Amino acid sequence: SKIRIGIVGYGNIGKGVEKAIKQNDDMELEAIFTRRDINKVDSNNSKLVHISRLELYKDTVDVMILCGGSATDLVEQGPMIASQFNTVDSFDNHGRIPQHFERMDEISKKAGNISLISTGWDPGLFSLNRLLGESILPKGKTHTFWGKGVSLGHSDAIRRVQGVKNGIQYIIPIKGALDKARSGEQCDFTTREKHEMVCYVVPEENADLKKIEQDIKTMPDYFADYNTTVHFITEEELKLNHAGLSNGGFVIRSGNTQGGAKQVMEFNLNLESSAEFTSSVLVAYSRAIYKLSKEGKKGAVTVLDIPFSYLSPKTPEELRKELL
Amino acid sequence: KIRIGIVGYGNIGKGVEKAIKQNDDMELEAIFTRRDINKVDSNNSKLVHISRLELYKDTVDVMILCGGSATDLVEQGPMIASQFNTVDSFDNHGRIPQHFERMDEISKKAGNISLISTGWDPGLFSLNRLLGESILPKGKTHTFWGKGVSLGHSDAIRRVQGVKNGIQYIIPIKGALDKARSGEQCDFTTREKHEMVCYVVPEENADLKKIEQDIKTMPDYFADYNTTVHFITEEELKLNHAGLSNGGFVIRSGNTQGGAKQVMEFNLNLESSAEFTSSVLVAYSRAIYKLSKEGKKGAVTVLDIPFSYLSPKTPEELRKELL
Ligand SMILES: CC(C)CC(=O)C(=O)O
Secondary structure, X not given: OOEEEEEEOOOHXXXXXXXXXXXXXXXXXXXXXXXXXXXXXOOOOOOEEEHXXXXXXXXXXXXXXXXXXXXXXXXXXXXXXXXXXXXXXXXOOHHHHHHHHHHHHHHHHHHOXXXXXXXXXXXXXXXXXXXXXXXXXXXEEEEEEOOOEEOHHHHHXXXXXXXXXXXXXXXXXXHHHHHHHHOOOOOOOOHHHHEEEEEEEEEOOOOOHHHHHHHHHOOOOOOOOOXXXXXXXXXXXXXXXXXXXXXXXXEEEEEEOOOOOEEEEEEEEEEOOHHHHHHXXXXXXXXXXXXXXXXXXXXXXXXXXXXXXXXXXXXXXXXXXXXX | OXXXXXXXXXXXXXXXXHHHHOOOOEEEEEEEEOOOOOOXXXXXXXXXXXXXXXXXXXXXXXXXXXXXXXXXXXXXXXHHHOOOOEEOOXXXXXXXXXXXXHHHHHHHHXXXXXXXXXXXXXXXXXXXXXXXXXXXXXXXXXXXXXXXXXXXXXXHHOOOOOEEEEEEEEEEOHHHHHHHHHOOOOOOOHHHHEEEEEEEEEOOOOOOHHHHOOOOOOOOOOOOOEEEEEEOOHHHHXXXXXXXXEEEXXXXXXXXXXXXXXXXXXXXXXXXXXXXXXXXXXXXXXXXXXXXXXXXXXXXXXXXXXXXXXXXXXXXXXXXXXX
């Protein structure tokens, strides 16, 4: 009696979800809903179904994983699906999370369904670890760093600079700050001390390299506040070595005991494929939502409300014997 | 406001006392000791003889069992659970299933809740082993225990004839640790992951030292590890081996469909191992308090508790701040 999963959106995350479901013997992919004309997108991928027929799958989908195609509804249609299915999404706008919760909570309850919002690595796993850290060590400081990954906005920003043909940006934690955080010494970090930015640019012929470097570095709202390095490369090297699909980060709680003893907790991720990891997280949490939906849990929930036991297909006894 | 009772005043109990002070929503009702009334009125404190534990019915919300002995907890845990909600750090992994059943039976019948085996391992490390396995079902989990005392093995060596007193350390092997992190995945033998270093204060007759190295051949505890053994004086052990610091690593190295290297790591660097356990116990007491009020009964483990229950903040404050 497999868990029937439904995927909304067939972008990198939707594709990643489909893949991860193959690593989970207790799950079955029922359908992948897409806005694209599946008449063209072929026909022999039995799973593809046009988004207009989503409603027809109310009795065949236990959990719908929202992988926002890659446009507006990628922040606007959790509500529309929630009224028909139990949902799981990775809404990542931290500032608007409180509001997303309320919206999904109303719709979820009103429909007698459960909706998991803001899961993934951050929000998601990183959130859980910040929580754990400040709960276990009430006195101390939390430090989150976002490992080497691309900042889409920044790459577009770089492309706006005169003389720049193409390019990519990376935000990278500064080892100095990581070491200090990991050491027991407490401290607050300035933006400039936590992360640096590295750009790899393909210049237009001629252009003026020293000038591009300074236009990027002094760029307000993007690089001005960070130590920024600019490397010049060819289009080939960009395509070859800057796919930009990797990422990671660190969540560190530096606390002090009562007598001044230094206690440090750390959680970190090293992901060769950011999207596929987010997808794996989405899938695991689908198992939890399915379980909670059966127990009649109603409304919206975050990773903060879910016991880790629900993420596993093993029985409580098996977990206590093998992993505790 | 949450009334805490501390059972046992060893290093963990002491650590719990101080940890409670770091929590505004908590209050220490009493510290229960098994020390004879052989005292100077005590020496003054929050210390109360264990025989009076029963008098605290309906004045204590959670009894944190700080005993470091899993063997004693076998019987003591059940006794307390029949009277109060409890939280313990039963650390004998092989016997957890039994401890769980016994505490479960007892707490259920008494309408109380009993959290067993919390701390850093069992506890935090257990949670991360589960998280790793669930997130990356296709991979390998590797746990290492940073440099520090292993305690059990300290008493273990204390069984070798000729050893009066001693201490033992477990130390992760950098090579194994780095490989685990690489995401290359693989299997390590016990010997490839940790090494053991002992310091022994010997003799009962200026005993045989070559034989003392009965430690190296000791099944289970040692032998599976490259174990070094140093002989020192009681004096040396006292001033140079107060093994308080410790830590460890829990790494999940996996691959997603396609071979992409994905690595998850959780680790601890603790200057005061006992006090960290104390902090963990206290935070979990809050969750147990909350659960008890919800009518939850029976035994639970860290695996059954949502992280939100560990915080005094409101569900709204957590989403606005930490999510
Ligand atoms: C989704 C992107 C537009 C976010 C962004 O601005 C960035 O990553 O730099």
